[PDB]
Amino acid sequence: TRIKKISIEGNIAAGKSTFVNILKQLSEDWEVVPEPVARWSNVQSTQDEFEELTMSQKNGGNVLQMMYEKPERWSFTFQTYACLSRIRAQLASLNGKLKDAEKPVLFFERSVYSDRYIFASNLYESESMNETEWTIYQDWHDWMNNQFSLELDGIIYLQATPETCLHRIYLRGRNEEQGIPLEYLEKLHYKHESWLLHRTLKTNFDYLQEVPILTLDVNEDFKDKYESLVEKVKEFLSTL
Amino acid sequence: RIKKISIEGNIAAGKSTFVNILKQLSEDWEVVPEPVARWSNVQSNGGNVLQMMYEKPERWSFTFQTYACLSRIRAQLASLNGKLKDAEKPVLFFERSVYSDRYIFASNLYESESMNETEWTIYQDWHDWMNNQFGQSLELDGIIYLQATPETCLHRIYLRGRNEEQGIPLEYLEKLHYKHESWLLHRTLTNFDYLQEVPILTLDVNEDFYESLVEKVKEFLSTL
Ligand SMILES: Nc1ncnc2c1ncn2[C@@H]1O[C@H](COP(=O)(O)OP(=O)(O)O)[C@@H](O)[C@H]1O
Numbered sequence: 001t002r003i004k005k006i007s008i009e010g011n012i013a014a015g016k017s018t019f020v021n022i023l024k025q026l027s028e029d030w031e032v033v034p035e036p037v038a039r040w041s042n043v044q045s046t047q048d049e050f051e052e053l054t055m056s057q058k059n060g061g062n063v064l065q066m067m068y069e070k071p072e073r074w075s076f077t078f079q080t081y082a083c084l085s086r087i088r089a090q091l092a093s094l095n096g097k098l099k100d101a102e103k104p105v106l107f108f109e110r111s112v113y114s115d116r117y118i119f120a121s122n123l124y125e126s127e128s129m130n131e132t133e134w135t136i137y138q139d140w141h142d143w144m145n146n147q148f149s150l151e152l153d154g155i156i157y158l159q160a161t162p163e164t165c166l167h168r169i170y171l172r173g174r175n176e177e178q179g180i181p182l183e184y185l186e187k188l189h190y191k192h193e194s195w196l197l198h199r200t201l202k203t204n205f206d207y208l209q210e211v212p213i214l215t216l217d218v219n220e221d222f223k224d225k226y227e228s229l230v231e232k233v234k235e236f237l238s239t240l
Numbered sequence: 241r242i243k244k245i246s247i248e249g250n251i252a253a254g255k256s257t258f259v260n261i262l263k264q265l266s267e268d269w270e271v272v273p274e275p276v277a278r279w280s281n282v283q284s285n286g287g288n289v290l291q292m293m294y295e296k297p298e299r300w301s302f303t304f305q306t307y308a309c310l311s312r313i314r315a316q317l318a319s320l321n322g323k324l325k326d327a328e329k330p331v332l333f334f335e336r337s338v339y340s341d342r343y344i345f346a347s348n349l350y351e352s353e354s355m356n357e358t359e360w361t362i363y364q365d366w367h368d369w370m371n372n373q374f375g376q377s378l379e380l381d382g383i384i385y386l387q388a389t390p391e392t393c394l395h396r397i398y399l400r401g402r403n404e405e406q407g408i409p410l411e412y413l414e415k416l417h418y419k420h421e422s423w424l425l426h427r428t429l430t431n432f433d434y435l436q437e438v439p440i441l442t443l444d445v446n447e448d449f450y451e452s453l454v455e456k457v458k459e460f461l462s463t464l
């Protein structure tokens with residue numbers, strides 16, 4: 001497509017949703033694909049066209065919480081569903097949004113690359129996924145990718161300390177995340193740094209080595225840096 | 241333009257045997273085996289996820305079922321992509337389909353509580369999506385149902401000698417048989433509404449191996 005695809009990346013509660021959903025109003029050609037975290041805390045599949053007329057769409061289980069409560073049991077299930085639901089959402093907005101925009105930009109809250117190379121990879125490294133699960137996951141992810149359009153034109157990395165992220169998890173108050181310890185955020189932090197700052201992390205996706213990356217420090221209170229962040233963003237986009 | 245035909249039936253009914261015979265009747269006829277080897281040796285020597293599922297179905301059934309279907313979709317798409325399409329009347333025989341994966345096997349595991357509600361819902365959502373994207377391409381023109389009794393199937397499991405399967409009880413095979421009968425014989429069993437229209441040839445394969453069965457296929461296909 002003519003739509004530029006830009007992923008917003010960063011640790012848990014770095015402020016990606018906040019930033020990008022405020023950022024996107026600056027232009028009517030700018031849209032966001034949220035991460036489907038609602039679909040994870042309330043697991044639902046489609047109703048039959050007649051049954052939905054008389055039966056409600058009930059609340060399902062919370063696979064996000066199942067993963068946090070027992071990662072060695074539920075990591076693989078969670079990570080597969082996370083990626084699937086993301087791909088669904090990103091593909092539909094690609095094929096559906098920003099038609100007849102002049103300079104259309106679609107910002108993705110996280111990417112299939114961070115699902116694999118940050119979150120899933122970290123679970124494998126922590127023995128929360130075994131060899132078989134990790135092989136199946138990567139096999140499936142490779143296949144999904146070679147099938148599917150989503151190639152990124154750029155990455156905006158929102159960098160915050162593990163401590164900042166831990167505080168913001170508390171501020172946000174998602175119930176399933178309230179037992180996350182500092183060490184877990186630290187491990188995710190180092191993965192992001194390797195991928196997006198030091199660029200030493202190797203992926204199956206050659207183009208990524210070349211994709212332009214904008215790194216923005218988001219540790220400060222929202223007002224204190226937003227103007228410079230916005231100006232850095234428009235400057236970056238002008239380069240793509 | 242490739243006609244797509246799925247061969248269905250219970251564990252060790254004789255589907256791989258039958259389709260491998262069929263294949264030889266024409267250069268225009270190809271087969272997509274169930275990727276069983278890929279499940280026995282997980283790779284991109286790996287784990288045996290078929291074995292893990294049979295040994296600990298409450299732990300591994302969702303993982304197994306997801307990979308089973310993923311690997312089938314992959315193999316089936318691959319075969320349409322190259323294997324014939326320069327043939328007079330090309331036919332592709334699938335050893336099982338995404339519909340048996342979901343509505344027979346995964347469904348039976350949910351029923352027996354080897355998957356919980358969350359796993360079953362994730363599985364169905366994944367399958368719905370994965371199909372809306374492809375499926376149209378993998379849509380069946382006909383089904384051949386190989387019907388054999390659960391006892392015949394249990395005997396043939398023993399004859400074939402797959403280690404992971406040797407402990408399967410008759411009762412599990414009875415459950416699978418009832419789902420197949422419901423789907424393909426009684427037609428009481430899906431949210432793929434085109435399937436209600438797909439012709440089904442039922443073949444009784446309970447007897448030791450068959451001439452006539454193969455001819456019945458050659459002619460059933462001329463009606464598609
Ligand atoms: N710069 C900031 N200053 C103060 N709070 C922030 C800032 N960025 C995000 N927040 C807050 O931190 C929490 C997590 O932000 P959120 O956008 O939900 O993170 P993410 O989408 O990266 O997980 C929210 O409660 C939000 O109000």
Ligand SMILES: Nc1ncnc2c1ncn2[C@@H]1O[C@H](COP(=O)(O)OP(=O)(O)O)[C@@H](O)[C@H]1O
Binds near residue numbers: 250258446
């Ligand atoms: N009609 C038959 N008579 C005797 N043995 C059969 C017959 N059909 C299959 N077999 C044997 O039974 C076993 C199961 O057959 P196979 O084709 O592997 O089953 P499937 O592909 O349905 O699981 C094999 O060892 C095969 O040689």
Ligand SMILES: Nc1ccn([C@H]2C[C@H](O)[C@@H](CO)O2)c(=O)n1
Binds near residue numbers: 035037064079082083
């Ligand atoms: N592949 C992903 C994506 C997200 N998350 C988690 C981190 C947050 O708790 C929540 C939403 O980003 O889901 C995860 O564990 N794995």
Ligand SMILES: Nc1ccn([C@H]2C[C@H](O)[C@@H](CO)O2)c(=O)n1
Binds near residue numbers: 251274308341345
């Ligand atoms: N969706 C599927 C497909 C196949 N099988 C099993 C039954 C046999 O034991 C083996 C190969 O057919 O895999 C399964 O449990 N579920």
